[PDB]
Design a protein around this nucleic acid. Structure first.
Ligand code: MG
Ligand code: MG
Lengths: 143, 362
DNA sequence: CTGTGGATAACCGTATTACC
DNA sequence: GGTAATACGGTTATCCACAG
């Protein structure tokens, strides 16, 4: 798949499973750079998020991780998105395992989710579950 | 000269975090170089060459030099760099002629200190290529070295540090006169300033403290600390003592002038500060390995003392900016607990990122 | 317990003149 | 404390499958 919201898709055997049968599970993970700031404090910058994830809800569910200290590290969480980009800056404290914070974020927030294929369509008036082949075929014969 | 033990256990000296370790060694040598220049013998040139090696020259200081694993800065074996490099090369030029020697694979010499060419002045250069036998990634990252040189330059004032990169013909050159003042200026040059830069220095019971601080229109505070020019990545007593004096002297000012008692932070919303103190050996204790956290219980009051004094006086400087900070604080408390209250439950406003009454528009 | 997207169905604050 | 008629705003609960 090529999501309009970008990101990273993990799970080729399952993309295959889903193109074979119509059903599969795949992981979808946000794009991130790490940003070394003045002084010496690192800062995670998220720049693509998973398909159909509410950005506000997300930013909020991260500040919700901060103020509940569900993990330590997060000094500030701040949506810097604008006209020419999508930028969420998660700024960390001095001395805070950045790898730890990132992984806990992927695990416990929607910074990373699952996409489940379930490809049903109406093919001759009845629903059918289809892989890539009856879809492409069906297309072709239509044309 | 070179040292077998570091090769046998490089992490223990450098921490081959690769190539974060690779950069740890460059810190070592160049800090040693700086140190040796501070010893009276006033500029260090760091050069990332095009062939990938690192030259580091200054203008029996020689083995006084190349023996690092010394995070000083505080203005048959031995030496970890020569020991951790497929090739090192020490050229001294002291008295009308230049002596040189090179060392290969691990520290083994390969030529004698002989003379080659006569130089008309003095100085010493060490150039070296690390090895991808012990190192994964031997790429010297220009921006990292640039950064460390920079902060190294805030800290020690009587020295200047250059850094040129033959790979991509560029070169910075750091020299800071105002010092720790100029540090915190650099911490808040990306941001929007509020108050100007505060600065107090001190000396007591063996401790010499120097603390500069100023406000941006931000949320997270930025407070970096140094015992003896090495950093305290995780702070401790000296820091807590500085923090014990800002909320102490302000609450006190709060009760008098600003009427008004307030939390720990609230007064540190958007406060960046640079803390560098000097502890004597007899008072200097850390934590369970790694100088990352100061433990010295005497440093908590001596910092608290020095800063709280100065800050009490220079709080009678102006009142325009004093009542104002005490106003912003009282604001911060309110905003803070407005989260605590909202949380316990478990408004159409779309609020501006940076709190600053002076500039914000509703 | 939350959100997804195509369907169902409602709901009520304000202004303005005018008169008991 | 009420309604008249043409205007300005916005909001909620349900079904259905399928995920943690
Ligand atoms: Mg997840
Ligand atoms: Mg969900």
């Amino acid at each position: 798949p090529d999501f309009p919201t970008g990101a990273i898709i993990q799970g080729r055997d399952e993309i295959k499973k889903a193109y074979e049968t119509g059903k599969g599970r795949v992981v979808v993970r946000s794009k991130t750079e790490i940003e070394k700031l003045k002084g010496g404090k690192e800062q995670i910058v998220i720049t693509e998020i998973p398909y159909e994830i509410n950005k506000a809800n997300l930013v909020k569910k991260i500040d919700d991780v901060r103020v509940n200290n569900k993990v330590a590290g997060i000094a500030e969480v701040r949506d810097e998105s604008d006209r020419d980009g999508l930028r969420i800056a998660i700024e960390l404290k001095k001395d805070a395992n950045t790898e730890l914070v990132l992984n806990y974020l992927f695990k416990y927030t929607d910074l990373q989710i699952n996409y489940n294929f379930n490809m049903v369509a109406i093919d001759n008036f009845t629903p059918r579950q289809v892989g890539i082949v009856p879809i492409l075929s069906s297309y072709i014969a239509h044309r | 000269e070179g040292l077998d033990a570091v090769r046998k256990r490089p992490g223990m000296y450098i921490g081959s975090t690769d190539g974060a370790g690779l950069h740890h060694l460059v810190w070592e040598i160049v800090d040693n170089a700086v140190d040796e220049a501070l010893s009276g013998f006033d500029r260090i040139d760091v050069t990332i060459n095009k062939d990938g090696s690192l030259t580091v020259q200054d203008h029996t200081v020689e083995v006084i030099f190349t023996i690092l694993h010394a995070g000083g800065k505080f203005g048959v074996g031995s030496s970890v760099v020569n020991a951790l490099s497929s090739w090192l090369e020490v050229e001294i030029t002291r008295d009308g002629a230049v002596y040189k020697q090179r060392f290969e694979n691990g520290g083994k010499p390969v030529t004698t200190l002989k003379k080659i060419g006569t130089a008309p002045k003095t100085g010493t250069k060490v150039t070296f290529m690390p090895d991808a036998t012990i190192f994964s990634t031997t790429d010297f990252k220009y921006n990292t070295i640039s950064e460390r040189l920079n902060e190294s330059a805030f800290l020690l004032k009587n020295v200047t540090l250059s850094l040129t990169d033959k790979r991509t013909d560029e070169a910075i050159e750091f020299h800071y006169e105002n010092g720790v003042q100029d540090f915190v200026s650099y911490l808040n040059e990306d941001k929007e300033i509020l108050t100007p830069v505060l600065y107090f220095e001190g000396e007591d019971n063996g401790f010499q403290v120097e603390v500069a601080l100023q406000y941006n229109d931000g949320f997270s505070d930025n407070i970096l600390s140094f015992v003896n020019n090495v950093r305290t990545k995780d702070g401790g007593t000296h820091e807590t003592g500085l923090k014990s004096a800002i909320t102490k002297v302000m609450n006190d000012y709060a009760r008098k002038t600003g009427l008004l008692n307030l939390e720990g932070s609230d007064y540190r919303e958007g406060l960046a500060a640079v803390l560098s103190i000097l502890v004597p050996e007899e008072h200097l204790q850390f934590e369970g390995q790694t100088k990352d956290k100061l433990g010295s219980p005497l440093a908590r009051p001596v910092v608290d003392g020095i800063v709280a004094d100065k800050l009490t006086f220079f709080l009678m400087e102006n009142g325009e900016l004093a009542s104002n900070l005490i106003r912003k604080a009282i604001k911060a408390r309110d905003a803070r607990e407005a989260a605590r209250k909202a949380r316990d439950e478990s408004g159409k406003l779309t609020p501006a990122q940076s709190k600053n009454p002076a500039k914000n528009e509703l």
